[PDB]
From a paper:
Unlike SETD3 or METTL18, which methylates a unique substrate, [name] specifically recognizes an xHxH motif (H is for histidine and x denotes small residues.) and catalyzes the methylation of the second histidine. xHxH, as a known metal binding motif, is found in a wide range of metal binding proteins, suggesting the potential role of [name]-dependent histidine methylation in mediating the metal binding capacities for those proteins. Based on the predicted [name] structure from AlphaFold11, we chose to mutate its surface-exposed hydrophobic residues to stabilize the protein. One [name] fragment (METTL946–318) with six mutations, named METTL9M6 afterwards, exhibited high solubility and homogeneity. In all METTL9M6 complexes, H1 and H-2 are snugly positioned into histidine-specific pockets, while x-1 forms hydrogen bond or hydrophobic interactions with METTL9M6 and x-3 stacks with the aromatic ring of METTL9M6 Tyr306.
Next, we solved the 2.10 Å structure of METTL9M6 bound with SAH and methylated [name] peptide, in which the peptide is well resolved with His375 methylated at the N1 atom, demonstrating the histidine N1-specific methylation activity of METTL9M6. The distance between the methyl group of His375me and SAH is 3.0 Å, indicating that it is a postreactive structure. The product-bound structure is identical to that of the substrate-bound structure, indicating that no remarkable conformational changes occur during catalysis. This finding is in contrast with our previously solved SETD3 structures, in which the imidazole ring of actin histidine rotates ~90° during catalysis. In contrast, H375A abolished the substrate binding affinity of [name], and the side chain of the substrate histidine did not change orientation during [name]-mediated methyl transfer, suggesting their different substrate properties.
Author numbering:
A (entry chain A): 45 to 318
B (entry chain C): -4 to 7
Amino acid sequence: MAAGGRKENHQWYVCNREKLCESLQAVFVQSYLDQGTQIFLNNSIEKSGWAAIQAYHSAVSSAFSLAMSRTSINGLLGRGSMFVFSPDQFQRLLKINPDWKTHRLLDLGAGDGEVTKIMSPHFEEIYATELSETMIWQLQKKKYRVLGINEWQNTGFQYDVISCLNLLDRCDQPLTLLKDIRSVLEPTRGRVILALVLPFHPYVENVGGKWEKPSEILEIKGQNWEEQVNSLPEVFRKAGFVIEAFTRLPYLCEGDMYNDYYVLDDAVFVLKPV
Amino acid sequence: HQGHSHGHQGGY
Ligand SMILES: Nc1ncnc2c1ncn2[C@@H]1O[C@H](CSCC[C@H](N)C(=O)O)[C@@H](O)[C@H]1O
């Protein structure tokens, strides 16, 4: 990226590295608006131009929003898919080559699986958890093994990569979740992929736009992206992890009648057990 | 209007 390069959306990827604590400066990885990101964006723009589809989705969402979560409406229609990293960004962050493969992936709160699918080619077996009925159906159409939310900790095997993308701010017990993850991650070579939207603002999605506060508190604190990232090493340490690498990445989402796509600000970490 | 599927974002 260049300081005068147009249409690179620098604000999606740069941080003020001097605002990071020294240990985080050493492991920050710069990401860029790459080919796979642009395909997602160009796909979303096209989709947002299918007016009859958008109008149908918007009428169904309006009629049934009182009876079903937003997540379940999206899974019902197959809409509003999201993007965290391209295969290239995922591989550069994990430091693996395009052909690297291992045994088992577990993707917790996998949504409709369109982010899971970026990671899937690197694994022989893919497992996932999810609370939304329609999202479970989307995961099963992708042939992922859906485990109960208290089933994955008790399978009798460990997981070589556990991904926990944008769930910590949406689940009831994030600290119990992190500790469960550590207890079943393969310890000699396993890694955790974690994504968090900053500013950290957690809640538990319910029906009808309703929501609840989580029953466990993550101690994420700061006045900007960098300070909040700075609070995370100690949060991960409590759960038995150190950050091996991390990056800033736009958390992209397909659009609707009003915008071609939507953006949130993701911090994405590779954790190793300690 | 559905917005971002992850929900609405607050501030620091
Ligand atoms: N305790 C829990 N266990 C499994 N899924 C959960 C959960 N609490 C919330 N969720 C699910 O977590 C998802 C968060 S949206 C994040 C989806 C995907 N990982 C991505 O990064 O794009 C929603 O699909 C929601 O249904």
